[PDB]
Write a protein that binds this ligand. Structure first.
Ligand SMILES: *[C@@H]1O[C@H](CO)[C@@H](O[C@@H]2O[C@H](CO)[C@@H](O[C@@H]3O[C@H](CO)[C@@H](O)[C@H](O)[C@@H]3O)[C@H](O)[C@H]2NC(C)=O)[C@H](O)[C@H]1NC(C)=O
Lengths: 48, 48
């Protein structure tokens, strides 16, 4: 965990965690308004 | 358009000739929204 969190690049723990927050690429990275893909209440929540 | 095998007159033609899909890619990879830039246009140029 120490090594992973000290890492900063695309392998960084910070980015692997920010998948579930900001910055946002959801639904598509190119959109006027962006959200997070934390699919809540939908039928793909356990899958994700 | 020549390798696409579409003659220039086909642009004027009442048939729907084609369109273009543009997209902007940032240096760091985070593609910007297409709204940040205007709509490209197609110009014609006759012979002299
Ligand atoms: C990767 O590149 C993109 C664009 O090429 C960078 O996005 C730019 O910077 C920020 C996001 O980091 C955004 O604009 C800013 O938003 C904040 C939100 O409060 C605002 O306060 C600032 O005044 C600014 O407007 C936006 O995504 C973009 N800025 C633009 C389009 O003007 C992004 O930062 C880059 N990421 C890295 C890690 O370098």
């Amino acid at each position: 965990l120490q090594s992973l969190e000290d890492d900063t690049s695309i392998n960084g723990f910070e980015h692997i965690a920010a998948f579930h927050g900001q910055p946002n690429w959801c639904p598509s990275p190119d959109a006027e308004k962006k959200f997070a893909c934390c699919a809540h209440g939908m039928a793909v929540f356990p899958h994700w | 358009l020549n390798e696409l095998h579409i003659r220039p007159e086909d642009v004027f033609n009442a048939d729907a000739p084609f369109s273009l899909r543009y997209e902007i890619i940032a240096v760091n990879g985070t593609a910007l929204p297409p709204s940040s830039l205007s709509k490209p246009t197609i110009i014609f140029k006759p012979a002299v």
